Structures are given as structure tokens and as C-alpha cells.
Design an enzyme around this catalytic site. Sequence first.
Site, PDB file in Angstrom:
ATOM      1  N   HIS B 351      79.807  31.440 111.443  1.00  0.00           N
ATOM      2  CA  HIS B 351      79.971  31.223 109.982  1.00  0.00           C
ATOM      3  C   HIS B 351      81.356  30.701 109.617  1.00  0.00           C
ATOM      4  CE1 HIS B 351      76.158  32.927 108.673  1.00  0.00           C
ATOM      5  NE2 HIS B 351      76.278  33.659 109.803  1.00  0.00           N
ATOM      6  N   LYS B 542      83.873  32.673  93.491  1.00  0.00           N
ATOM      7  CA  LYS B 542      83.869  32.906  94.958  1.00  0.00           C
ATOM      8  C   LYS B 542      84.918  33.974  95.271  1.00  0.00           C
ATOM      9  CE  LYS B 542      84.364  28.623  95.290  1.00  0.00           C
ATOM     10  NZ  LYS B 542      83.572  28.018  96.395  1.00  0.00           N
ATOM     11  N   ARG B 543      84.843  34.577  96.452  1.00  0.00           N
ATOM     12  CA  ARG B 543      85.882  35.533  96.873  1.00  0.00           C
ATOM     13  C   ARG B 543      87.241  34.835  96.746  1.00  0.00           C
ATOM     14  NH1 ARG B 543      84.423  40.386  99.394  1.00  0.00           N
ATOM     15  NH2 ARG B 543      86.707  40.564  99.449  1.00  0.00           N
ATOM     16  N   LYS B 548      90.313  28.857  99.915  1.00  0.00           N
ATOM     17  CA  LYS B 548      89.429  28.371  98.833  1.00  0.00           C
ATOM     18  C   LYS B 548      90.259  27.809  97.663  1.00  0.00           C
ATOM     19  CE  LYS B 548      85.861  31.856 100.066  1.00  0.00           C
ATOM     20  NZ  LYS B 548      84.529  31.200  99.948  1.00  0.00           N
ATOM     21  N   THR B 650      77.860  28.179  99.767  1.00  0.00           N
ATOM     22  CA  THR B 650      76.510  28.262  99.168  1.00  0.00           C
ATOM     23  C   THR B 650      76.576  28.298  97.658  1.00  0.00           C
ATOM     24  OG1 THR B 650      76.482  30.614  99.626  1.00  0.00           O
ATOM     25  CG2 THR B 650      75.390  29.114 101.211  1.00  0.00           C
ATOM     26  N   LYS B 654      74.287  26.380  94.557  1.00  0.00           N
ATOM     27  CA  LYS B 654      73.717  27.038  93.395  1.00  0.00           C
ATOM     28  C   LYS B 654      73.986  26.209  92.158  1.00  0.00           C
ATOM     29  CE  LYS B 654      74.716  31.337  95.703  1.00  0.00           C
ATOM     30  NZ  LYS B 654      75.537  32.545  95.684  1.00  0.00           N
TER      31      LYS B 654
HETATM   32  O1  LIG Z   1      77.155  30.860 106.090  1.00  0.00           O
HETATM   33  C1  LIG Z   1      77.485  31.781 105.052  1.00  0.00           C
HETATM   34  C2  LIG Z   1      78.930  31.689 104.607  1.00  0.00           C
HETATM   35  O2  LIG Z   1      79.684  32.459 105.542  1.00  0.00           O
HETATM   36  C3  LIG Z   1      81.025  32.592 105.132  1.00  0.00           C
HETATM   37  N1  LIG Z   1      81.642  33.554 106.022  1.00  0.00           N
HETATM   38  N2  LIG Z   1      82.188  33.269 107.218  1.00  0.00           N
HETATM   39  N3  LIG Z   1      82.633  34.394 107.736  1.00  0.00           N
HETATM   40  C4  LIG Z   1      82.339  35.379 106.854  1.00  0.00           C
HETATM   41  C5  LIG Z   1      82.668  36.793 107.036  1.00  0.00           C
HETATM   42  C6  LIG Z   1      83.375  37.217 108.157  1.00  0.00           C
HETATM   43  C7  LIG Z   1      83.683  38.557 108.324  1.00  0.00           C
HETATM   44  C8  LIG Z   1      83.314  39.477 107.370  1.00  0.00           C
HETATM   45  C9  LIG Z   1      82.612  39.069 106.259  1.00  0.00           C
HETATM   46  C10 LIG Z   1      82.288  37.734 106.089  1.00  0.00           C
HETATM   47  N4  LIG Z   1      81.720  34.881 105.794  1.00  0.00           N
HETATM   48  C11 LIG Z   1      81.734  31.243 105.183  1.00  0.00           C
HETATM   49  O3  LIG Z   1      83.101  31.454 104.818  1.00  0.00           O
HETATM   50  C12 LIG Z   1      81.008  30.272 104.244  1.00  0.00           C
HETATM   51  O4  LIG Z   1      81.536  28.946 104.376  1.00  0.00           O
HETATM   52  C13 LIG Z   1      79.515  30.252 104.536  1.00  0.00           C
HETATM   53  O5  LIG Z   1      78.868  29.501 103.510  1.00  0.00           O
HETATM   54  C1  LIG Z   2      76.571  32.602  96.436  1.00  0.00           C
HETATM   55  C2  LIG Z   2      77.591  33.663  96.284  1.00  0.00           C
HETATM   56  C3  LIG Z   2      78.812  33.655  96.999  1.00  0.00           C
HETATM   57  C4  LIG Z   2      79.221  32.560  97.952  1.00  0.00           C
HETATM   58  O1  LIG Z   2      79.910  31.516  97.200  1.00  0.00           O
HETATM   59  P1  LIG Z   2      80.908  30.469  97.927  1.00  0.00           P
HETATM   60  O2  LIG Z   2      81.407  29.614  96.774  1.00  0.00           O
HETATM   61  O3  LIG Z   2      80.033  29.732  98.947  1.00  0.00           O
HETATM   62  O4  LIG Z   2      82.061  31.281  98.510  1.00  0.00           O
HETATM   63  C5  LIG Z   2      79.673  34.697  96.806  1.00  0.00           C
HETATM   64  N1  LIG Z   2      79.414  35.699  95.948  1.00  0.00           N
HETATM   65  C6  LIG Z   2      78.280  35.727  95.257  1.00  0.00           C
HETATM   66  C7  LIG Z   2      78.066  36.872  94.331  1.00  0.00           C
HETATM   67  C8  LIG Z   2      77.334  34.720  95.398  1.00  0.00           C
HETATM   68  O5  LIG Z   2      76.180  34.781  94.664  1.00  0.00           O
END
Ligand SMILES: OC[C@H]1O[C@@H](n2nnc(-c3ccccc3)n2)[C@H](O)[C@@H](O)[C@@H]1O
Ligand SMILES: *Cc1c(COP(=O)(O)O)cnc(C)c1O
EC number: 2.4.1.1
Lengths: 810, 810
Positions: B351, B542-543, B548, B650, B654
Site C-alpha cells: 500500500h 484525508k489523514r 499529503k 481513494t 470519491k
Molecule cells: O490502498 C489503500 C491506501 O493505503 C494507504 N496506506 N498505505 N499504508 C497505509 C497504512 C500503513 C500502516 C498503518 C496504517 C495504514 N495506508 C496509502 O497511503 C494510500 O495511497 C492508498 O490509497
Molecule cells: C476514503 C477515505 C480516506 C482515504 O482518503 P485519501 O484522500 O485517499 O487519503 C480516509 N478517510 C476516510 C474517512 C475516507 O472515507
Amino acid sequence: QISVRGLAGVENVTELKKNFNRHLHFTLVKDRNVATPRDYYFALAHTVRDHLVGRWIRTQQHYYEKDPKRIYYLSLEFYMGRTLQNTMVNLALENACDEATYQLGLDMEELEEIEEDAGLGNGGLGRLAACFLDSMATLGLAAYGYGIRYEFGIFNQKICGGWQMEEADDWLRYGNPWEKARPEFTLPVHFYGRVEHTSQGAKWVDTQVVLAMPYDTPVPGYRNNVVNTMRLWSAKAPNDFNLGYIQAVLDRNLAENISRVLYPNDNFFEGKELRLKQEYFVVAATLQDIIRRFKSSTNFDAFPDKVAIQLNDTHPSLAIPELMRVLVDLERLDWDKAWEVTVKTCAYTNHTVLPEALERWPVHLLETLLPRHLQIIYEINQRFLNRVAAAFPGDVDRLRRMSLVEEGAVKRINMAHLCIAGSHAVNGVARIHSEILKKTIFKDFYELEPHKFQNKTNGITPRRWLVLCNPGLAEIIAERIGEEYISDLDQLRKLLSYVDDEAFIRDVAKVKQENKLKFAAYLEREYKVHINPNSLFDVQVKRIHEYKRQLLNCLHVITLYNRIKKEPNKFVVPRTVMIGGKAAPGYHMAKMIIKLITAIGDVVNHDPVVGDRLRVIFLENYRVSLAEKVIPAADLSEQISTAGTEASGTGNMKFMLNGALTIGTMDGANVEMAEEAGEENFFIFGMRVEDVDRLDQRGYNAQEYYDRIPELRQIIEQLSSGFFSPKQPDLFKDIVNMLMHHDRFKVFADYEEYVKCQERVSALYKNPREWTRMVIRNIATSGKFSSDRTIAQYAREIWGVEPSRQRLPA
Amino acid sequence: QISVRGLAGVENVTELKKNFNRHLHFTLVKDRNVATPRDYYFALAHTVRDHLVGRWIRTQQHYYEKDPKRIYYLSLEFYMGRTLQNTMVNLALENACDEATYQLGLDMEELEEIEEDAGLGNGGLGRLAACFLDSMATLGLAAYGYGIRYEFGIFNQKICGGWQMEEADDWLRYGNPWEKARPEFTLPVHFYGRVEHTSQGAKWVDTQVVLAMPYDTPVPGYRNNVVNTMRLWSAKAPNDFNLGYIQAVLDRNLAENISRVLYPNDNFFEGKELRLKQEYFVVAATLQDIIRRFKSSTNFDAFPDKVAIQLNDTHPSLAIPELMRVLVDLERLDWDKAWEVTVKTCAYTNHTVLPEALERWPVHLLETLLPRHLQIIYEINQRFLNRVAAAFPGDVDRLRRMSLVEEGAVKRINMAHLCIAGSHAVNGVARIHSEILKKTIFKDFYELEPHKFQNKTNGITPRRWLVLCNPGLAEIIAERIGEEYISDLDQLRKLLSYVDDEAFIRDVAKVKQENKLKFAAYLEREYKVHINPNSLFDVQVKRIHEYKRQLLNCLHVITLYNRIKKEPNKFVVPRTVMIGGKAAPGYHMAKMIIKLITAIGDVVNHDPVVGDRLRVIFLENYRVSLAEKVIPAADLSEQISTAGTEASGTGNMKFMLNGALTIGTMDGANVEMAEEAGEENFFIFGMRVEDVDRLDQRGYNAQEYYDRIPELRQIIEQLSSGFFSPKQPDLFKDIVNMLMHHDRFKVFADYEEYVKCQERVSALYKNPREWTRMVIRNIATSGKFSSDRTIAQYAREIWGVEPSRQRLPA
Ligand SMILES: OC[C@H]1O[C@@H](n2nnc(-c3ccccc3)n2)[C@H](O)[C@@H](O)[C@@H]1O
Ligand SMILES: *Cc1c(COP(=O)(O)O)cnc(C)c1O
Ligand SMILES: OC[C@H]1O[C@@H](n2nnc(-c3ccccc3)n2)[C@H](O)[C@@H](O)[C@@H]1O
Ligand SMILES: *Cc1c(COP(=O)(O)O)cnc(C)c1O
């Protein structure tokens, strides 16, 4: 099948079956091909609970409209046991559910056995609270049980190598279908902080908040369509609690530990902070609820016309300073008005005189945990001691004896003293116990306020303790005098005119034999043990305690064994001696007594000369659901506490009701039982209270009995020398040592009279017809020992409300 | 009301109402006079769940009879959000429930708002797992989500003084009506102990047992009558655990802490033992369940024909040595056979490439906690490195780079390396991300086993992310092309023939305006804040993460503000700039960025010269249910990660689906979105991947941008000197310092091209008709980004199963 279990109508049965299938599908998300007996129990539990809810809602709304005076039964213990059969009995659904389950191809009795006991109590005190809730519902009182929803109840007892092992009673693992969470009525409880004094009075500040979340369990009355509420509190951390991040969330368990585990001590005080937290938690959350309900009707003069608060021992004694604190600090009443309201609202039941059971809380603990409550307690003590000084001028001694504050290395609050000061009524739990309170530990309080001291002799609910556990005996009684006795147990006296009826004599003996056959077969199935059902069933079941003298029983058992071995070819009435009970985990001597009982069993039950003339069985995990099985099977009830130690007892009543004769001391309610039945229908032995006092005056020398009774010296030499412990010869030196030098309960002093009285029991057992006639005279006079009589006396003489047997509409 | 919400039949509505009243009475033990909105939500939740159970039972029994290949989606995160509306959408009950609730005088939308989000995830990864479960159910795959039932999900975010405060997400407080406890399928999980070597192989002994209790939640497919299962494990102590007495019972919380709390890190590795315990717990309990199900059909050759196990990142990488351990030590397969079975069963999704997110577990931790697993891992590494040596003879460097074991002060296991060795397929989550894996961090693994490396571009479920959150847009699309697009999103391409249709242009703009009005009014009600609904809604949700580049957005906002103040009387397109997201509690810089955003808001929103031309709003507690509100209201989607950091994203999808234009970098799935819509329908700016590499070759000097861009030097001088923090002038020195000396994500390098591209956005917003035509070209090409396409690709190219859109019978 049997009449007292009610009608199985075609419509009722059809309806129970379609609701059983609806719950299995929609509630349990099972089909018939993968369901286990446990899913079947749950579908039936949900089906029977559906019949409660209409009545529960109507009952709670009737109490809103009528606004009757409301009774609050505050206890740290509610020993409820199983709910399913009890609900069916009280709604007259038992035959309909038997029928409905039978036509789905299931056995209702097998599903009943899957229910966990709600074991939120230690023994007699918790079980008294459960019997009381049943009687308050049956007598149409607007009554609420308030306690703690412990995640873990009394521990499960395993025996390994004849030793007690404790396991956590994880009774909520599969869910509790009887309870309804009410997270919307969650209330804050405060701890720690400090007191600020303003112009606008005292203020309790910088506290820690724990939330109290209530769970409501229905309490159905006997066929009157009344459903009262038992509300139990669970501890929850607030969401800002500790709020690095991960540890803060994990540390929520510090707050939630308050409702985690029942303290497993019977008749013993352990002064631990967690226990005091439990005591405040239930008192604080309960009083906010009581007051909230009161205000939905400014004027606290009316409060005692609308509220009775009964304290089940001192465990909720903090209700007294808590009510003062709310009235003085929050509602801004003057002290004397708040105090008047408090005294007229509160009443205190004392359950024991054993000095090690009396709650005496170190001041340093109350200072840290409840600083405002300690201020109010000092203020109560000052004003109380001013009334003592004025009534008994110059009696400085009376002043130190009566103080709520005990002087010493550590200062303590005497919580019993607080209860008497703050209550309009103080009662003991049997006539002899109430007399002992006025003559000894509360003599001073009695001379100050004689009008406060009452007796309310304990009782048991004949719904659980006759109809439910002994249907065959219920039925043959119902054959002859009808069904009304179940809610009016004095009607059993009509059985005295059947004492010479041959058919009734045969039926009473047949029911006893059936109960014994069914209990023998339960032993064989669940614990692979082989017992003669034609033997006299000699049972002592109760918590393991030195004052209850399981050891005296052990001495009789070893005596019978030594007599058989001396004269092996002589007839003796065969006995199965069954002793059961839990020891508190930290009670070394109680743990040793269990071990001795099994060690005796290991010698007696494997001696080929003995045959099946004498068996000794330790009944593992004695609890409410085992009491419902063994008490109907018993011939002889062992109630053998040293005179003046068993405040009442309630086991004794269960066995009287269920067709056992009693061997006991003139202790507790044994005295009133013997008076009701006649002394000639009771096996009374041993020192009276007066005799124990005479012995204490001159000094108890156990050596004197050892020197004079060769049969007793034989037993003590066998114990000492490893007869009962060949691998560890000295295993029982603590027991010998205590019996010879430090026996507070004078086991040897009652030994001779016990063994002789046990010979009279054996003699009457040889004459089945006269044994059964004596049983009839016992069952027939057991009516006084209904909790319906007890609660009617509490209601008329303490709470100021009138019981009623009138049905609510369905 | 609207067609895509289904029929409200007279019989359906009558039936929903009588079941709503049955649940309120019998389930909730409320009447209509005391019920709260929360009781109403519960009665409706129970009513809709009743429609699931028949389908759930039939679906699980169909999978027993057909015995298809079974897919196991192992994740530590499932970001589910609310269940009620989603269930109604997928069962076509939404209008019937609207109608039924309306006739009881209730508003269904008001009851929907009472549901807690199931927030068992951090962001994109957890939410991808939720979108996937929905697509697997809609495509009739025999699929199971397996995870942990955390008692506490992602923390609730409060802002005090513009700072993030964390509160515990107590999401189970009121109960979860969607889950079914299955305590009967409780399994043991082992920890600690040690390895004994016998004749009969290796043996893991003296372990600590934690029990894993499963909770099953239904996952309904879109109108196909399929209901799959999400099984989440809860940790329970065994009843002999620690078994002085009281402490032993309280210490059960040590074992139960495993499932207490979700770790709140996004794209960050924290090497804590509790996290490793969570990872083993879910892997151990899940594999026993998988194997149990397999054996109900000796022969493990067939196992990969019956089982696919998908690893959601490395979080469940221990599934690989755990499967080996069960096959070698318990089933007694030889190593090479067990290994073949393991590789053909397992597949690994990566990921992220951010090095601080990659799990690298210290060997000392695995040694203590999982000693047998570490033995198997060393053995996997030895055999793997022997294949590397043989393929690349003499390349000792390749050997150290590819080792599962990293040498250093502390030895570590590289869990990603373990996943590639033990998996038959490795995929990234967007085409550019998958290319970056083959060119950089997994280049060596790629050259060894090129056949293993795949792309599976992420998607989102158009059920939650169109039909459910944006009904008005669903409907006007359905007006013109029908309803089939909801389970076949490529049909949206038929909207390109409506790009010059005036009525469609008016309807798309009207839906956007309605969404904005309804979102503006939600801000006003729940957070007392006043925003112009005719402004361009510029949203970045987003986080909070440095990669980002919320900070780049901050720089644009301060740029617009400085331009207004220089030329106050000049027209600018008005904007509402909304930034939302949580920071990990230990992520100091993320916490500072939130504070800067609110500090900017405090200056901009109170400047009277600014008017309502520019507003800056921090959206508190961004979560799935806030995404469903704000994403339909957005005009501009900010996807502005430095090229090569956002693996996919993602959120971006949306917003494309919901009628916002995108301003973004050529990063992640932005690349495929721009290719689907056409680059001319996308606001692309900034360095490409190649450009960032060129900058890294020669060195990133931020000073160069500060020296050359007077607009940017102004911003940095304002930040430094306390313009945005007058009370603490130096509050933001960490931010300035990082931007000028230690910016891993080259914020200044994209600043100029960002501000210019933002001017093009403003220019097109002035021309509503051309803005709306560009929106249509985006919605119309968003079909590729359905999780149905993603899952169909996983199924055909990895799992070896065929999706199906055929209904099960009802
Ligand atoms: O495929 C799902 C999404 O995955 C996110 N993503 N990567 N590592 C993580 C992660 C890693 C450790 C603990 C929690 C979360 N979370 C990516 O940053 C994003 O670009 C993708 O769209
Ligand atoms: C879809 C979604 C995300 C992921 O968004 P990114 O812009 O891809 O980081 C994070 N949090 C919530 C609540 C979402 O619905
Ligand atoms: O009235 C109920 C019964 O109460 C018992 N009883 N006293 N203190 C207690 C007690 C004290 C502390 C903690 C737990 C329990 N429990 C008496 O021993 C018994 O004689 C009565 O029949
Ligand atoms: C009734 C009862 C008791 C109390 O018995 P005593 O002989 O009065 O000590 C204790 N435990 C259980 C389970 C009971 O049912």
C-alpha cells in the site's frame, strides 16, 4: 403433566412454538441443522422473556400513576441463581413450555441445565436478597433491588487432590438474556478530590468521575402480573479519561475494575480500597436515581413518605452520609432537617455478631477516597455523642463505646454504629439474634433508643424452594389442600390432619425416594461416583466456616467409621454423608477442612469392611442450582453452629420445607423452627447460648474433653499420626492444634451430645412410618419461614406500606 | 420519493411498521411515551437486520453445498462506517423504510444520524477493506473479512484552542445490533513459551493462552440476495488465567488488552509488542477457522484450490510462518510440500513505499513472543537466499539486500520481504505505484520472480459513495441511463452524450447546489459557523501527513489572503477552503499543521476587508460519515501529494464520482483518473516522479525558492514573526524550520505551479456552464474506479475464481 405447573392450552403451546422458531431464526441466526442445546436454551429464554415485557412495562407505568411509597433494597449481593424456570413458575407457563418444547423434540429440563447461575453473592445474605425480591413482587410492593453487576460472581470451585481450586465465574460469556442495558440512565460517581469551604457552604472538588451504567432485570411476582426491577450498576470510564494515547485507553480498566469481581468472603471483613469503592459506587449511583424518581411526582419533608431505603448490613452504610451530603451540600437543606429526613428514610438489618465480620474502615482510607463523607461522619458522631452525654451524664465510658470513631493505632469508623445513629429501625434476622443485639454488641444503643430495635425472622420463597425444586412434593400437597399455600405458606398447617393418613404417608416417602434416586443419578452422570439410594442422606451444605462446625460433622463421621471397624458384623443404619460448600480463597483453615473432608472420604469410601454402610461425598461447587437438587433429596439437615454464632440461617428453612428432619443446636432460626414443629419433632442437642457463656466465664479447656472421651482421643490420635494422610503424616497438625488450644467454637464441648443425638436419628430412620410422620409435622409447620411473612413484617413495621395479593390486569 | 431508493409497497410498509413496534416493545422494552430518538434508531436497526438474516443463513448454507473456493481478506483495519442506510440500499428497502417511519411520525434521516461509525480503521487502507467486502458480496464471491473487534476504534477528534484533542471512540457503549457473538466458535491463541525438539519434530510448549471469540457482521451484496460475513475476533482470558484471588481476576485485562484499541497511525510503523500481539492474534485465530472449514468438505494438495488468503499489507504477514507451522508441526507435512501450499494460498498487497511505514520487527521481540515463528522465518530466509545465490551467483550484495533479516545494531525481520517470498502474487494499488515497486524497493525480487508482480488499481463502492451519500445525483443519472450503472459503473460513459444537453447541465449544477446548501446548514447547526454557499468549495479531507502536503494548501490560502489585502477592491472568485483530517497522536508535525490551519482561519475569517470572499474551515472529526456529507458538497478536490508518495489514494475517486473537479499532482490513481477523463478535464500541476528524482540527484535547496519567489518569502516572514500567532510569536518555528531545511516532500518546489493552476480553477468557476460540462466529463469517466472492477481483477488474476452478478433465490 402435574397440576401446579399450570395449563398447556392448544393456543398457548402453538404460540410458544412459533415464537421459539422466530427467536432461533431471527435472534440467534441459527437453523435447526446447526443449533446446539445452548441455542435451544437461548430461543426458549427469549420466548419466556417476551411474556415478561408487557407486564414489566404496565407495572412500571402503574407505579408512575399510583405514585405509591417506593422501597429500595440496597445490597452488594443478590444471589439470584437461574431465572428461566422461576419465570415460567411465576407466569404459569411451565406445562405450556414443557409441551411446546416436547413437540419440537427437545427436553426442557436438559435446556434448563444450560443456564448459568447468576452467582452475585456469597451465601445466606445474598440469597436472602433474592428471596426478598420475589416476595416483594408477589406482595405487590413498589420495590427495587439495587446492587452491582459484577462481571465475575462467586468463583467456581474445583477439587484437585482434595484441595479447593478457584476459577473465575465468567457468567456473562454467552450473554444474559434477562438483563436490559439502560446506557441512557448512566450517572456519574465521584472519588478522591478535596473539600473547599465557601460562603455558599462546603464543595467537593477535583474529583475523579466513574460512570455508573444501569442494567435492569425483571422480578416477576407469583401469578399477580407484577414485574419489579432489579437495577445493577456497571462501572464505565468517561471518554476523556486519562485524556500517551494507547496507555490512556488501556488505563480505563482502573475505573472499570470497580464492578469487575464480587469479594468472596462470607461473614468476614477485608478492609481493601476496591471494596470501599464498590460500596460507594452502588450507594452514590442508587441515591441519584432514587432522588431523580422522587422529583418526578423542592419539598424533602415528603421524602420519607415516598422513599424507604433498606440497608442490607453495613455494606451500603455510606447511603447515610451520602443522603446527608446531597441534602446539605446540593439541595441546601439545614443539617437538622436533612438528618430527620435521612433517619426516617433509612433502616438497617444486622446479619451477624461475629466481630471479624463487622465493617471498621480506617479513617486514612475515607480521608483519601471520600473526604466530604468523613466530615459528615465526624459531624454525625459529634451530635450523636451530645445526645448520649445528655441522657447518661458523666458516663465517659459509654461515650467511647458508642462513638462512631474507634481510637487505636489506626482510627476506624464503626459502620454499624453509623447505621444505628442514621436509621429509624434496626433489626436482627431471628428472635435469638435480635435478643443478643439488645443484650451484647448494641446494648448501649438499645438503652438510648429502645424503640429502634426490632426482630424480622428470615424466610425463604416457597416458589423457588418448593414449587420449582420439588414439584412432586408441591403436587401431593396441592392434591389435598389446593394451590393457595404457594402464596400463603401458613396453609401448610392443614397437613397436620393428614399425619395418620396412610396414602399421604406413602406419597411423602415416595417423593423423597424419587428425589434421592434422581440425585444419586445426577452424582453418577456429572461426577462418576456410586452411592446407595436406600441410605440416610445426611447433608451439610453451607459456606465452609469454623462457626458452622463442618469439623464437628467430621468427628461424627470418623466416630461411625471407628465403630464399624471395631464391630464390623453389627447392623448400622447406612448413611451417605454429603458435605458441600466454598471456602473464601484466603481462609486457610476453611481450605484445610475441605481437604480433611476429602481425606476422610478417601479412607472411608475405599475400606471394603465398610461396604456401602458409610459414604462421605464432598459436593463440589455448592451454589443455588446445586441447592435446588440436593435439598429435595436430603433426609437429615445438619444445622450445627455453636449457639450464638448463626444469626439466623436459611438453609435450615429450605430443608424443613422439603421433607428432611433437622439435627441442630438452639441457634438462629433453629429455635423458632423447633418451637413451630415441637421440640419432639426436632433433633436438638448441645450447649445453649447460656451454657457457652458459662464455659467462657470459667475458660474453655479442650484437653478436659480429650482426657475424658476415649472415642474422641482415638480420632485426635488418628488425625495427628497421619491415619488420614499417610503420604504427609503432619498434614492436619493445624486442625489438631486449633481444636486442642484455640477453638473459639468449642467443637469438643458439643461432641458427646452430638454423637448421642445422631444415634436417636439412626433409631428413628429404622422406623420409616414414624420418620415420615415426623417429616409431615415439619413440612406442616414450615409456613412461618416464608419470605412472604418476613416481607409483610418489614412492610407493616418498618416501611409503612400495606402488602397486597391483588393481580394487576394482564 | 426517488426511483433508485426502490418501491414502497402497501404490504412492505405495513409489515415494516408492525415489526418496528414489535422491536420497540419486546426488544427495547420501551413504549412510545418514553422512547428517545436513540430507541427509534434501534427499533429500525433491528427491523432492517431482520431482512438480512434469511439471506445470511441461505448464503452460508449455499457455500456449504456448492463448496466454492473461499477468499479470506485478512486486515487489521475495516473502516465500515454506518451500516443502517447501506443495508437498506442493498436490500432495496430505503423508500419502504422512509414511508413506514414517516407514517409513525418519525424522520428516518434524523434516526440515521444516531448510528455510531464503526471506525475500526485509520483511513484509505481500512476503507479499501470495507469497499472490497461490499464488492465481493455484490460479485457473489464466497469471501470472508477477518480482523479484530477493537473495543475502541479511531479516536474522536476535538479541537480546543485550534489544537487536536483525542477522545476514546466508545462505539459499543449502546450496543452494536449488526454483530452476532459466536462464543461457541472460540479458539485458543498461543504466546511466549519455547521450542522443544523431539524425534517427532519441533513442539511449541509452556505457552500463554488467549482465547479469540468471533463476532460475525453481515455484508449484503447489491440486490443479489448475497450476505457474506465479516468475522472480528475479541480477546478473552481463559477461566484458570492467573489461577491472590482478586488480583488474578483483575489481571485478566492483560490478555483482553489485545483487542482493546486500534493503533491510530496512518502510513507509520510503531514497533510495539501490543501491536505484534494484535497481528498474531488475528492470524492465529483466522487460520484455525480457515483450516476447520476446509476439513469439513488429510489432503492439503487441494488447499490452494479451496483457499485464497489475501494479506492487506504486511500487518498479517505472520499468516505465512503460521500456515507453515500448522502444516509442518501439527499436520506433519514435509517442508517443501507445506511451502508450495503456503505460496499458492497467499498473496500480498503493498500500500506504500514510504520507508517509515514498512514493518521491520526486532528479532528480540519475535524471539520472546513467537519463538517457533522466528525459527520458521530463519528457515524461509535460508532457502530463499539459496535460490538467489543460484540465480545470481557471486552477487553477495543482492544477498544482503534481499535477506528477510536486516543486520544492524538491532536485527529486524523485513515483513515485506517475508510476504514476497511466501506469496504467489504481489500487487501495488495504482499503475504508477506498481511500476515504482518494480523499479525501486522490490527491483531485486522482481528480477528473481517477475511473474509474481501485478497491478490492481484501487476503487471505491458506488453503493456507499454515490447512491447512499448523493441520492439526487444517482437519480438524475438513473433518469437518463437507468439503474444498471450502480453494479456496472462503466455504464456512466453513456453520460458523455449528455455533455451538451441543457437540461442535464442544469440538473448536475442543481444537485451540486442542493448538496452545498444542505452541507452549509449542517455546519451551521452542529458547529455554529456561517459560510457562503455560492463560494467554490475547495476541500482537502484525508489523514494529516507531511506527504499529503496540507502545508502546500496552507501556502495557497495565505497567498489568496495576501493578494486580497494588497488589492482589496478587486474581484476574486469567492472560496470556502475546508481542510479536515486526524493526526496520529504522537505525530508532532501533523499536530502543528492542524494548529496552523486553525490559526490561519482565526486571521482570515475575522478580517473585515476579506468579507465572505475567503473562509478557512477545519472540519473536526473527519471520518466515514463526515466524508458522505462533504464529498457530495465539494467543487474542488485537493489531491496534492508529492509525486511518488500517495501509492493510490481513494478520496480522489470519491470526489470524481460526486461532481468535483480535481487539482492534483501526477501521483497515485490521479494518473489513471486524468487518463480516463482526459488531461484537459483535470487540473494537473507540479513535479512528476522523474522531476522529484532529478531534484534529489542534485539536492533540494528550499532557500532557492524562498530567494526567488517574493510571494513565498512574504508568507514565510509572516509565519516566523507571529502574524498568525501574536500571543506566541515563535509558535510555528518548527514548521518554518522544516520547510527551509528538512522538507522531504519539497513543498516549495510545487508552490509556483500550484498557485498558477489554482488561478485556472478560479477562471473556469466564473463560467458555470463550462465548469459543469467538465464535471460531466469527470463523472462520465469515473467507472474504472469502482471496487467492482478492482475485485473482478483480484478474482480473475490472483484468486482464480469467476465473479457472478446472478441473484441467489430470496
Ligand atoms: O490502498 C489503500 C491506501 O493505503 C494507504 N496506506 N498505505 N499504508 C497505509 C497504512 C500503513 C500502516 C498503518 C496504517 C495504514 N495506508 C496509502 O497511503 C494510500 O495511497 C492508498 O490509497
Ligand atoms: C476514503 C477515505 C480516506 C482515504 O482518503 P485519501 O484522500 O485517499 O487519503 C480516509 N478517510 C476516510 C474517512 C475516507 O472515507
Ligand atoms: O440473614 C442472612 C444470613 O446472613 C449471614 N451473614 N451474616 N453476615 C454475612 C456476610 C458478611 C459480610 C460479607 C458477606 C456476608 N452473611 C448470616 O451468617 C446468616 O446467619 C444469615 O442467615
Ligand atoms: C440458602 C443458601 C445458603 C445459606 O445457607 P446457610 O445454611 O443458612 O448458611 C448458602 N448458599 C446457597 C447456595 C444457598 O442456597
